Every structure is written in C-alpha cells, then in structure tokens.
Design a protein around this motif. Structure first.
Motif, PDB file in Angstrom:
ATOM      1  N   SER A   1      62.914  38.248  51.588  1.00 48.39           N
ATOM      2  CA  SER A   1      63.198  37.890  50.197  1.00 48.39           C
ATOM      3  C   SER A   1      61.911  37.483  49.461  1.00 48.39           C
ATOM      4  O   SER A   1      61.834  37.658  48.250  1.00 48.39           O
ATOM      5  CB  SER A   1      64.244  36.786  50.123  1.00 48.39           C
TER       6      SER A   1
ATOM      7  N   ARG B   1      69.039  35.506  46.489  1.00 46.00           N
ATOM      8  CA  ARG B   1      67.571  35.518  46.474  1.00 46.00           C
ATOM      9  C   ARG B   1      67.070  36.925  46.834  1.00 46.00           C
ATOM     10  O   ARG B   1      65.900  37.227  46.602  1.00 46.00           O
ATOM     11  CB  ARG B   1      66.997  34.502  47.470  1.00 46.00           C
ATOM     12  N   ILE B   2      67.956  37.790  47.361  1.00 44.83           N
ATOM     13  CA  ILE B   2      67.575  39.159  47.772  1.00 44.83           C
ATOM     14  C   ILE B   2      67.059  39.929  46.538  1.00 44.83           C
ATOM     15  O   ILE B   2      67.840  40.121  45.597  1.00 44.83           O
ATOM     16  CB  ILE B   2      68.697  39.899  48.550  1.00 44.83           C
TER      17      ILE B   2
ATOM     18  N   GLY C   1      72.797  31.645  48.528  1.00 45.95           N
ATOM     19  CA  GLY C   1      71.519  31.992  49.141  1.00 45.95           C
ATOM     20  C   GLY C   1      71.215  33.483  49.158  1.00 45.95           C
ATOM     21  O   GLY C   1      70.063  33.877  48.972  1.00 45.95           O
ATOM     22  N   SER C   2      72.250  34.328  49.334  1.00 43.86           N
ATOM     23  CA  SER C   2      72.108  35.797  49.360  1.00 43.86           C
ATOM     24  C   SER C   2      71.665  36.381  48.034  1.00 43.86           C
ATOM     25  O   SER C   2      71.175  37.511  48.020  1.00 43.86           O
ATOM     26  CB  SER C   2      73.375  36.481  49.868  1.00 43.86           C
TER      27      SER C   2
ATOM     28  N   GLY D   1      77.859  33.608  52.350  1.00 46.23           N
ATOM     29  CA  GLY D   1      77.651  34.052  53.718  1.00 46.23           C
ATOM     30  C   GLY D   1      78.703  35.043  54.160  1.00 46.23           C
ATOM     31  O   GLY D   1      78.407  35.939  54.961  1.00 46.23           O
TER      32      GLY D   1
ATOM     33  N   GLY E   1      76.404  37.604  53.168  1.00 43.29           N
ATOM     34  CA  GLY E   1      75.175  37.560  53.968  1.00 43.29           C
ATOM     35  C   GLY E   1      75.313  37.969  55.431  1.00 43.29           C
ATOM     36  O   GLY E   1      74.417  38.631  55.968  1.00 43.29           O
TER      37      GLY E   1
ATOM     38  N   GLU F   1      68.526  37.095  60.944  1.00 46.43           N
ATOM     39  CA  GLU F   1      68.840  36.239  59.791  1.00 46.43           C
ATOM     40  C   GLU F   1      67.551  35.607  59.218  1.00 46.43           C
ATOM     41  O   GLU F   1      67.397  35.595  58.003  1.00 46.43           O
ATOM     42  CB  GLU F   1      69.897  35.212  60.170  1.00 46.43           C
TER      43      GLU F   1
ATOM     44  N   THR G   1      80.828  27.669  54.407  1.00 47.96           N
ATOM     45  CA  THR G   1      79.856  27.682  55.525  1.00 47.96           C
ATOM     46  C   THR G   1      78.850  26.511  55.451  1.00 47.96           C
ATOM     47  O   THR G   1      78.415  25.995  56.489  1.00 47.96           O
ATOM     48  CB  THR G   1      79.154  29.080  55.595  1.00 47.96           C
TER      49      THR G   1
ATOM     50  N   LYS H   1      65.526  38.415  57.645  1.00 46.46           N
ATOM     51  CA  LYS H   1      66.221  38.693  56.372  1.00 46.46           C
ATOM     52  C   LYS H   1      65.738  37.692  55.305  1.00 46.46           C
ATOM     53  O   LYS H   1      65.418  38.109  54.198  1.00 46.46           O
ATOM     54  CB  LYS H   1      67.754  38.630  56.544  1.00 46.46           C
ATOM     55  N   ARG H   2      65.621  36.401  55.653  1.00 52.61           N
ATOM     56  CA  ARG H   2      65.141  35.391  54.697  1.00 52.61           C
ATOM     57  C   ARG H   2      63.678  35.620  54.299  1.00 52.61           C
ATOM     58  O   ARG H   2      63.362  35.514  53.124  1.00 52.61           O
ATOM     59  CB  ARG H   2      65.341  33.975  55.215  1.00 52.61           C
TER      60      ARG H   2
HETATM   61  N1  LIG Z   1      66.092  33.400  51.003  1.00 50.91           N
HETATM   62  C1  LIG Z   1      67.202  34.015  51.428  1.00 50.91           C
HETATM   63  N2  LIG Z   1      67.255  35.366  51.368  1.00 50.91           N
HETATM   64  C2  LIG Z   1      68.355  35.987  51.805  1.00 50.91           C
HETATM   65  N3  LIG Z   1      69.466  35.455  52.322  1.00 50.91           N
HETATM   66  C3  LIG Z   1      69.397  34.115  52.345  1.00 50.91           C
HETATM   67  C4  LIG Z   1      68.328  33.336  51.933  1.00 50.91           C
HETATM   68  N4  LIG Z   1      68.633  31.986  52.020  1.00 50.91           N
HETATM   69  C5  LIG Z   1      69.857  31.979  52.447  1.00 50.91           C
HETATM   70 BR1  LIG Z   1      70.859  30.418  52.602  1.00 50.91          BR
HETATM   71  N5  LIG Z   1      70.396  33.225  52.694  1.00 50.91           N
HETATM   72  C6  LIG Z   1      71.704  33.564  53.226  1.00 50.91           C
HETATM   73  O1  LIG Z   1      72.713  32.969  52.438  1.00 50.91           O
HETATM   74  C7  LIG Z   1      73.899  32.800  53.248  1.00 50.91           C
HETATM   75  C8  LIG Z   1      74.477  31.415  53.034  1.00 50.91           C
HETATM   76  O2  LIG Z   1      75.667  31.199  53.795  1.00 50.91           O
HETATM   77  C9  LIG Z   1      73.503  33.160  54.684  1.00 50.91           C
HETATM   78  O3  LIG Z   1      73.975  34.471  54.969  1.00 50.91           O
HETATM   79  C10 LIG Z   1      71.973  33.113  54.654  1.00 50.91           C
HETATM   80  O4  LIG Z   1      71.391  34.028  55.579  1.00 50.91           O
END
Ligand SMILES: Nc1ncnc2c1nc(Br)n2[C@@H]1O[C@H](CO)[C@@H](O)[C@H]1O
Ligand SMILES: [Mg+2]
Length: 390
Positions: free
Chosen positions: A277, A344-345, A341-342, A204, A232, A270, A16, A273-274
């Motif tokens: 975190s 970081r949850i 990135g997911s 993702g 994600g 989305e 992605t 959601k970020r």
């Molecule tokens: N801080 C964050 N907290 C939660 N999720 C995140 C964060 N940063 C990223 Br980047 N994502 C997710 O990671 C995936 C990368 O393809 C996607 O689904 C983004 O939404």
C-alpha cells in the motif's frame, strides 16, 4: 461547587477490530492499547487459567481455535435459525449452540464447559476498550457512544446497548457507523443546505456502501448496499494461492496440507499486502517454511493488483446500486469518505476516484479510526450541560 467531569469515550465495536477515542482540548485522541496498537482485535480467548481479550487472544488463536471467539458481531441480536447464522457457523472453529432459538458460543473455560450470549462476548471486548481509555486518562470512565452498522435492526441495537451495560458503561447513544465517519470530517457542521455523502467501507470480511443526506446537521440514511463476501481476507487468500503455486513450481513441493506452513505463509502475505500500500514491491522471507526449505521471494504491487483485479472492480457494483436506490447521479455526491484498513489500497482508491471523475477522497483521518473518531466527537457533545445566559 461542581467537580470536573470525566471525559466520555467513543467506541467503534467492530466485527474484527475495535477502536476507542476521546475528544479533549478541541481534538480527538485515538487511544493505543498497552501493546502500542491503535486498534484492538475483537477476540476473546478462554483457557484453564485465564480469559484473554484483544491482542493476547488473537496471538494464541493457532493452537487454541476451539476456545478463541471472534465475529460475535455477526451473531448479536440474531436468532439461531437465521440463515446468515447457519452459513457463518461452517467457517468458525468454535461451537455455536441453540438456546431457545438464540445462539450462544460454547467453550472450555477454567475447568468447565461454559456458554455465552453474543452480547456477553461483546461486553468483554467493551471492558478492554474502557480499560485502554482509563489507562490513558488516569481515572475511571463511565460514559460512551457505541457505533453499529446502519442496517442493524432494533434487536441488534438493544443487544449492543446490553453489552455496554454488562461492561459497566453508560451508553449515551447507539449511532450508525457511516454517520460517525461523516461526523469525524465535520460534514454535519457545514451550515444550511443539503449535502449528499457516500461512505465507502471495506473491512476484513465485508464491504458496505452508505449514502447519507445531511441538512442543518440532521442525518438521513438514503441507501445502503454492499457485498458480504468481499473484504481484506479475500485479497490475502489470492496471495496465499499464488505463493503455494510458486513454491510448487520452484521446489516441486505442495505445502497446502501443513497448517503451520499455510498459517506462516498467510501471516507473511497479510504483512506484504500492507507494505504494497506504501511501496511498489515487497519481500516475503520465511525460514524453514516446509521440509527445512527457506522461502525467500518477492511480489510487485502490479502482480498483487492483477491477482485481486476482479475483487477490487466488484466494489463498484454496490456503489452503482446505492446510487440507483438513493435516486442520485454520481455528480450529485458532495463528499466521498473512506472507512476500513483495506481502503489504503492504491488501486481501490484509483478505481473509486476514476468512477467519480477524479474527485478527492476524504482519507486524512486513518480509515480504520474514522468511526471511533466521530463517536468520540459525538460523546463529548452529548455530555454537555450548558445553561443559557440571560
Ligand atoms: N495499509 C493497509 N493496506 C492494505 N490492507 C490493510 C492495511 N491496513 C489494514 Br488494517 N489492512 C487490512 O484491513 C483489514 C482490517 O480488518 C485487514 O484485512 C487488514 O489486512
Ligand atoms: Mg468498521
């Protein structure tokens, strides 16, 4: 005598998003693109007048779904008949055609119908990552290390090298993504003795767990496990369904049939959601979402955690399976590394840390950047040409 050599780069060519780094002055620099983004969407869009790559392609996807290509990594080095390919095609708005049992993506481009091999779409993403690096360095870049998933076979690895060659890059090496994440933390520089490292990669769209053994800088992949239907986007889907229900309760209106309203809701979900975190709550503010009704609401981290609770817990099933396959107990793992990135949850981190009885997780290198970071470290090592002293 001898001219200074250009820096070599490390590229994480992701399903992605892609990321590029360079090792200089004893450290890795993850390079932002011209819109200030440290990761670039692995998207290519085609119109009557242009070919757009990265953020420019992803930002116009809503009105050009048939001619905007993404997920080429899911097709690379595979046969058209492969059951993975056939199932994935039902979820894609672009056309995938059969050319001698090899998939090709077919689009409208500059007044004609054109078909591209997955390696050609990936070469377009690699051309953009090379240009991002050259904009920072201020000179042409030739050498690169490209990463792939540990489960990639020979055909998938050769097609990735082919994409690099089409992009004008000299591919120094194809390295495994979990190995690159380990290299990023210097887990291959800890001296003599065996270390067991678990890489926890939540993307993702997919989830991968890898167990590696490192002995005197030598890596061995001991076990791989995961979930192709966990990422994600599934957490975004849970928020979407929750807010659709909330709009129904509050305004007695079902928005689910206006694509624009659903898309605006998902984009907001989305971002919320970020925010969740780093914050314990997040606001959702959309103007004229449906029938001129403004949608101003909020969601607590506790409610989001409840909405995705089953999905977060299911990440531990591939962890236990990988440990059984590697024939190891959880206490025998020396290092835990987070990728994607997911990760970081906070709840995802808490569940995994609790599973490993309070152990610290390596998450100091941004998880969406760790793979490119390790690839950049390796690229600088591979171009060294030191001659021994007497
Ligand atoms: N801080 C964050 N907290 C939660 N999720 C995140 C964060 N940063 C990223 Br980047 N994502 C997710 O990671 C995936 C990368 O393809 C996607 O689904 C983004 O939404
Ligand atoms: Mg990745």
């Amino acid at each position: 005598g001898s001219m200074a050599k250009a820096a070599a780069i490390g590229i994480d060519l992701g399903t992605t998003y892609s990321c590029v780094g360079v090792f200089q002055h004893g450290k890795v620099e993850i390079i932002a693109n011209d819109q200030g983004n440290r990761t670039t969407p692995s998207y290519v869009a085609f119109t009557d007048t242009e070919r757009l790559i990265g953020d420019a392609a992803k930002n116009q996807v809503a009105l050009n779904p048939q001619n905007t290509v993404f997920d080429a990594k899911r097709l690379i080095g595979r046969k058209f008949g492969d059951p993975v390919v056939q199932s994935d095609m039902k979820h894609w708005p672009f056309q995938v055609i059969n050319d001698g049992d090899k998939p090709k993506v077919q689009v409208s481009y500059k007044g004609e119908t054109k078909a591209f091999y997955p390696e050609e779409i990936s070469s377009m993403v690699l051309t953009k990552m090379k240009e991002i690096a050259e904009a920072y360095l201020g000179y042409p870049v030739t050498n690169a290390v490209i990463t792939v998933p540990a489960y990639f076979n020979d055909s998938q690895r050769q097609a990735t090298k082919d994409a690099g060659v089409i992009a004008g890059l000299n591919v120094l090496r194809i390295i495994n993504e979990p190995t690159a994440a380990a290299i990023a933390y210097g887990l291959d520089r800890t001296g003599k003795g065996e270390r067991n490292v678990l890489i926890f990669d939540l993307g993702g769209g997919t989830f991968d767990v890898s167990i590696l053994t490192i002995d005197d800088g030598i890596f061995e992949v001991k076990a791989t496990a995961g979930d192709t239907h966990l990422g994600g986007e599934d957490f975004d889907n849970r928020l979407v369904n929750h807010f659709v229900e909330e709009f129904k309760r509050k305004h007695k209106k079902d928005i689910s049939q206006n694509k624009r309203a659903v898309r605006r809701l998902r984009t907001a979900c989305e971002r919320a959601k970020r925010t969740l975190s780093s914050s314990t709550q997040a606001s959702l503010e959309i103007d004229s979402l449906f029938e001129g009704i403004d949608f101003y609401t909020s969601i607590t981290r506790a409610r989001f955690e409840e909405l995705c609770s089953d999905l977060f817990r299911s990440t531990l099933e591939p962890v236990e399976k990988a440990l059984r396959d590697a024939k190891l107990d959880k206490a025998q793992i020396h290092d835990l590394v987070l990728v994607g990135g997911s990760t970081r949850i906070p709840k995802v981190q808490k569940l995994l840390q609790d599973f490993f009885n309070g152990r610290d997780l390596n998450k100091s290198i941004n998880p969406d950047e760790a793979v490119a970071y390790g690839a950049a470290v390796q690229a600088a090592i591979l171009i060294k040409s030191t001659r021994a002293a007497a």
